[PDB]
């Protein structure tokens, strides 16, 4: 299995814009070797996606959940 | 970026890794609200 | 799968404080009726465990994803 | 603290309810160095 010794990044690719009504929850992780990284796993259509986190919407998701 | 230390070793277990969706966007802390790109 | 039982917080306690160089990764998952519910897994410890996300160092994560 | 919205469809399955870690606390965006306590 692919292990974290190595600079391995989950998003190969990244879901950029992905569609927020397509998504159940966020997980984050920020990977060593890649900036904040965000995973956010989808609805019964798709299972996984690996996300922008510059994204406008995860933005302003970040900045609500501080205190909300 | 600022921190004592991250997760401290995650070892994350790629579980699907991605295809792209569309477009990128980078923030500027100062909001954005025309943006108007794809 | 009757997994929301009602308006209810996936955790019925949360685990506050806990040792962010002993985690694995967060997910925020909101429940339409609870606060930002995030939850992280320990790396090795104990299991996955539900953390209050009015935390420090849950704060200046989210704030510092925003820059990162 | 803007009740936008949450997730379309979270649907969230828990995993565990679980019981409580160490002290608790609410965000001061601040740095904190005066006082300490459990």
């Given at each position: 299995?692919?292990?974290?010794?190595?600079?391995?990044?989950?998003?190969?690719?990244?879901?950029?814009?992905?569609?927020?009504?397509?998504?159940?929850?966020?997980?984050?992780?920020?990977?060593?070797?890649?900036?904040?990284?965000?995973?956010?796993?989808?609805?019964?259509?798709?299972?996984?996606?690996?996300?922008?986190?510059?994204?406008?919407?995860?933005?302003?998701?970040l900045?609500?959940?501080?205190?909300? | 970026?600022?921190?004592?230390?991250?997760?401290?070793?995650?070892?994350?277990?790629?579980?699907?890794?991605?295809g792209?969706?569309?477009?990128?966007?980078?923030p500027?802390?100062?909001?954005?609200?025309?943006?108007?790109?794809?």
């Open positions: 299995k692919p292990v974290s010794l190595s600079y391995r990044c989950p998003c190969r690719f990244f879901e950029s814009h992905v569609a927020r009504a397509n998504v159940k929850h966020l997980k984050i992780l920020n990977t060593p070797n890649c900036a904040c990284q965000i995973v956010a796993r989808l609805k019964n259509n798709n299972r996984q996606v690996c996300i922008d986190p510059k994204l406008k919407w995860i933005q302003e998701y900045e609500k959940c501080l205190n909300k | 970026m600022e921190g004592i230390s991250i997760y401290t070793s995650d070892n994350y277990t790629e579980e699907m890794g991605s792209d969706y569309d477009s990128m966007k980078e500027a802390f100062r909001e954005e609200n025309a943006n108007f790109n794809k």
